[model samples]
Target: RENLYFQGHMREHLKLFSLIFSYPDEDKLGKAIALAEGIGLTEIAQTLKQVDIEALQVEYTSLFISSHPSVPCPPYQSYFEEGSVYGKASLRAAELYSKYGLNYVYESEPPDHISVELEFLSMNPELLSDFRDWFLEFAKCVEEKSEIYATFARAFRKFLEK
Candidate 1:
C-alpha cells in the first residue's frame, strides 16, 4: 500500500512538472526555470553553506525584477479576447453573454467584450459564485464535450491502433 502511494505521488509529480513546462504558457515556464536557476539546485550544500544568503537574495531579486516587467501582467482579458487581429472579441463574447441573461445595464455603445468591464461585472461578490460555477460548467462542456473529444480522435485516427 505504501509503495502504491509513493508510485502515485511520483506519477503526480512527473505530471505536474510536464504540465508546468508544457507549451502554450511559455512565460510561466520561463519564470519557473528562472526560479530554479536562482536556487542553483546542482550546487554543493557545503559551498552554499559558506555563501552569503543576503547577497544571493539581492541577486535573486535583481534577476527576478529584470526578468519580469510589470507592464504586461495579464489580469485584463483583452489580450486573450478573440479576433485580436482586428479588435476586441465582442461578437464571440456577446454570443456567450446571450446564453446567460447577462448584459450591460447602460447603453452598450462600446459593443461589449471590453474585458475589464466584463471582468468587473463578473467580480460582483453576490453573483460571483453563481457566475463562476455556471461559467466553469459551460466552459467544461464547450471545451471538453464529446464533440471536441471525437473531433480530435477522428482527426488523429491515422496514428491510432485499430
Candidate 2:
C-alpha cells in the first residue's frame, strides 16, 4: 500500500520543507524539485519549476531577511509570537531540539528559524502535535505574503492532521 511505503510520511515532508527553506542553490533546487515530484508533491514541484535560482534567492531574502524593512513574513518563530527574533519562543525551540540531541549547526540563525525548526521536527515526529500549533500560527501569519511557503505549511498541517 502507498501508506505502508510512506511509513513516516510526515517526517519526509518536514525534511523536504527543511531543505526547501534553507539556503537555495541550483543543485539544491533541482534535488528539491525532483524530491517533491517523487513524493507526489506535484503542485509544489510545479511551482518550484517556474522560478529560477535568483528569484528564489531574492524571495527568500525578502521574506526571511530582516534588513528589507518591508518584510511581509519573517521566518523565525519568535518573530511571529513575541514580535522579535531570539525571544523566549526561540529558547524553547532550542530546548526542544536539545531533547532530541540535535543542535543547529548554523550560528547565523537561531533555533527558531523555520528551516531549523522543520529539521528538528523531521527527526522527532513525537513532537509533531505540539509543534503543529506553533507552525500553523506561522503558516497563518505568512499565508497572505508568501504563497510558496504557505503552501508547504498548509501541506504540512494537513499531513499532521491526518
Candidate 3:
C-alpha cells in the first residue's frame, strides 16, 4: 500500500529514496524506514536500505537541502489555478482532505503543501491507493453532473511499468 501511496501507487519510489537519502539525519532516516514498513512502501523500503548516502550527497544536494529547516517547494495545482505562487490549492487540498477520510496529521498546519503530501502518500501505498481511486470516482462524478471537467484530474487505478 505504501508503495503506491506516492504517485497514487504509480511506484515512483525514487522520490522517497531521494527524500530520506537527502535528509540522512538519524531520526529522519529511521522515521522514513519505519514509515515505509508501516505503510508497506516496498520499493522505497528496499531503496532506503541500499541508498548511497555519500553519492546521494553529491547527486541530490538540492533535494536534501530542501528537506530540512524549511524545504523549498512549489504548488503546481495552485499555480495552475491562480497563475501565481501559493494560491488557494492549499484550501482546495484541505477541503479534499476533509472530504476524504485522510484525517491523519501531516507535517504541519500548512499541511506539507502538495508535493510533500504526495511524498507521504508515496511512502504509504494503501492509503495512497485509496485516495487515488477516490479521485477517479470524483472526477467521473463531476464530469457526469457538470459538463465542466475538473481542471485538475487524477486517476487512481494502478499503472504498469513498461
Better of 1 and 2 by TM-score: 2
Q: How many backbone clashes does candidate 1 have?
A: 0
What is the alpha-carbon lDDT for the whole of candidate 1? 0.31
Task: Name the lDDT value of residue 42 in candidate 3.
Answer: 66
**TM-score, model 2 to reference:** 0.82
> Residues 7-79, candidate 1, lDDT per residue (tens digit)?
2232222222222212213443344244333433222223223434455434333321133443111211233
Alpha-carbon local distance difference test for all models: 0.31, 0.74, 0.42
Prediction 1 TM-score vs. true: 0.21
lDDT of residue 24 for candidate 3:
58
lDDT of 1 at 85: 23
Task: Single out the weakest 10-residue window by summed lDDT for candidate 1.
Answer: 153-162
The deviation in Å at residue 112 for candidate 1 is 7.2
Model 3 lDDT per residue over 1-162, tens place: 344333442334424332442335555556666666664666555655555656544333343134454322222344334544455765766666666557747553353233444654654444654344333343343233321111111111122111
Which pairs of residues have clashing backbones in candidate 1?
none
Top-TM-score candidate index: 2
Model 1, runs deviating above 4 Å:
1-71, 74-78, 81-88, 106-162
Candidate 2 has an lDDT of 0.74
lDDT of 3: 0.42
